Paper text:
The HAdV-D36 fiber knob domain (FK), which mediates the primary attachment of many HAdVs to host cells, has a significantly elongated DG loop that alters known binding interfaces for established adenovirus receptors such as the coxsackie- and adenovirus receptor (CAR) and CD46. Our data suggest that HAdV-D36 attaches to host cells using a versatile receptor pool comprising sialic acid-containing glycans and CAR. Sialic acids are recognized at the same binding site used by other HAdVs of species D such as HAdV-D37. Using glycan microarrays, we demonstrate that HAdV-D36 displays a binding preference for glycans containing a rare sialic acid variant, 4-O,5-N-diacetylneuraminic acid, over the more common 5-N-acetylneuraminic acid.
In contrast, HAdV-D37 showed preferential binding to 3’SL over 4-O-Ac-3’SL and bound to several other sialyl glycan probes in the array. In the case of the HAdV-D37 fiber knob, the two key polar interactions occur between residue K345 and the carboxyl group of Neu5Ac and between the backbone of P317 and the sugar’s amide nitrogen, respectively. In HAdV-D37, the N-acetyl group is accommodated in a canyon-shaped cavity formed mostly by two tyrosines (Y312 and Y308) from the neighboring monomer, as well as V322, which occupies the position analogous to F325. HAdV-D37, on the other hand, mediates only water-bridged contacts to the α-face. Interestingly, the O-acetyl function does not contribute any polar contact and instead induces the tilting movement under the steric influence of the bulky side chains of Y315 and P323. This interaction is supposedly not favorable for the binding; however, the steric constraints bring the O-acetyl groups of the three sugar moieties into a position in which they contact each other by means of a triangular hydrophobic interaction (mean distance between methyl C atoms: 4.3 Å) that displaces water molecules in the area. In the complex structure of HAdV-D37, the steric influence of the two residues Y312 and P320 is observable to the same extent, but the overall arrangement of the knob trimer does not allow the formation of this hydrophobic interaction (mean distance between methyl C atoms: 5.2 Å).
Author numbering:
A (entry chain B): 183 to 271, 281 to 297, 300 to 365
B (entry chain A): 181 to 365
C (entry chain C): 180 to 365
The structure:
């Protein structure tokens, strides 16, 4: 009970636009008052599988949400499936984003956001932005939201990313 | 009583003096993971010269610095920009009740990051990151963190915030950035 | 002390790494085990040889180099790594423990997360990109590309590829520091 994670393989665990179209790899490790997080994404099918902004310039972003109840347990309306989220060998308030650092919705402060850049197919001229926001969803006690977005014109690029590390302040 | 975390608390009460007294909230969390300190930082400027950036009027106002200076016991010195009242080991969402006496285990390692008297200054005592003003992706600013480069102290962490875009009425309140550094002991 | 949770190069400036000439650089690498994740901190000081002072007006083709750490099934550094074995060990104070370690599997990159090379589809999650700055100057970026388990002739590997695209003129290759993490094998 120091790491909460998805399994590290590439089997689909996540639904963005159609069922089980993606594999989110998310590893949360509790280092006392901070959670060390490591994230990457493979889209395996559907709308976001192959990006072509030549033919669809307005398809530029999508969102994966993780919603948690008051005990830190993943809710079923999350994009990530509950069967795929477990401690490495179910309550987990110590992994939740701190509500004083990152308050629930209602102008708020930007420190509840972390930005990073990952790269599609591992190619250094294929950046995409991963925007991570804490506790800004409703209908839950805690949340972590990943928004993936890009501004370059990609032409038939498969959406599979390099890895990004961040941290956040833990609820307890 | 989390003896592995030194922090500012996560509230929004100003705790830092950049240009005028208590004009900002520096949120800084230092978590000891053995030989490395995991650090998380953000800044909210609430008043004064840096609260609203307008480079149309003053195109030369493009940076400022926040210094944390520590003595030989790792205790924050009063000439730091960060106030001492707010800086302590964590208890819940607040601080432990009494001011700490020793925190050498959280200081930047002096062999990795030597004092300015050193023969050679090495760039490894610097970490660069980018944060975003108002959380907007087209409002980057650079946070440059430097270890042990101040004088008049045993240890120091310096944050320099700067930007190169011409911002017009942009409030200086940032997204969060994580880094680490090698601990003294 | 005797810090079993840190595998490192020590933090001194003694050259320990061979890029183009023997012991022409100091790779400062600290691997700190936080359970299932390794917290990693890296920087590079080149002190001699062809990558010490970059001048792309005179040498326009010098734009990248790679430092490889290769490990066996026990997580022991192999002798054909760029990093010397004498310098790589568990931590004691600001130095290393006295005897060379025999097992460090808990610090190796996870083989399920970062599979070895094959003929099947290769996925990007075994790469982390960062930007560091030469001489600490904000207008002298270089890219550090870290790749897990993509070398052959080993059980595990961490490789650091350094590259840049600006035309630098007499710039000393000493980098700022970069932190990343990766999923541990055990
Ligand atoms: C032109 O600007 C970019 C680009 O191609 O979009 C920015 C990008 O960095 C970001 C943060 O997106 C950078 N890639 C990395 C991994 O740093 C590349 C790279 O330097 C060159 O393409 C040469 O490989 O240059
Ligand atoms: C033009 O270059 C920048 C910019 O606006 O200054 C660079 C910036 O990245 C850095 C490291 O400053 C990047 N923001 C993020 C969050 O990565 C934005 C963003 O891609 C576009 O604005 C589209 O939203 O583009
Ligand atoms: C022009 O674009 C760059 C550059 O000079 O190459 C990109 C570089 O960022 C990257 C990720 O390479 C950035 N440096 C930092 C530390 O963010 C500098 C900086 O903003 C200005 O030079 C002002 O000092 O601008
Ligand atoms: Cl695919
Ligand atoms: Zn396909
Ligand atoms: Zn205001
Ligand atoms: Zn405001
Ligand atoms: Zn220590
Ligand atoms: Zn030199």
């Amino acid at each position: 009970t120091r790491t909460l994670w998805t399994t590290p393989d590439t089997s689909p665990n996540c639904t963005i636009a159609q069922d089980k179209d993606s594999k989110l790899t998310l590893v949360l490790t509790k280092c006392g008052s901070q959670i060390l997080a490591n994230v990457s994404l493979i889209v395996v099918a559907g709308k976001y599988h192959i990006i072509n902004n030549k033919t669809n310039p307005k398809i530029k972003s999508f969102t994966i949400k993780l919603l948690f109840n008051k005990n830190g347990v993943l809710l079923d309306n999350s994009n990530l499936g509950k069967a795929y989220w477990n401690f490495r060998s179910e309550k987990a308030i110590g992994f939740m984003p701190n509500l004083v650092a990152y308050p629930k919705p209602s102008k708020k402060y930007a420190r509840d956001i972390v930005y990073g850049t990952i790269y599609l197919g591992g190619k250094p001229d294929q950046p995409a932005v991963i925007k991570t926001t804490f506790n800004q969803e409703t209908g839950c006690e805690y949340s972590i939201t990943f928004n993936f977005s890009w501004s370059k014109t990609y032409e038939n690029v498969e959406f599979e990313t390099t890895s990004f590390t961040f941290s956040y302040i833990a609820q307890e």
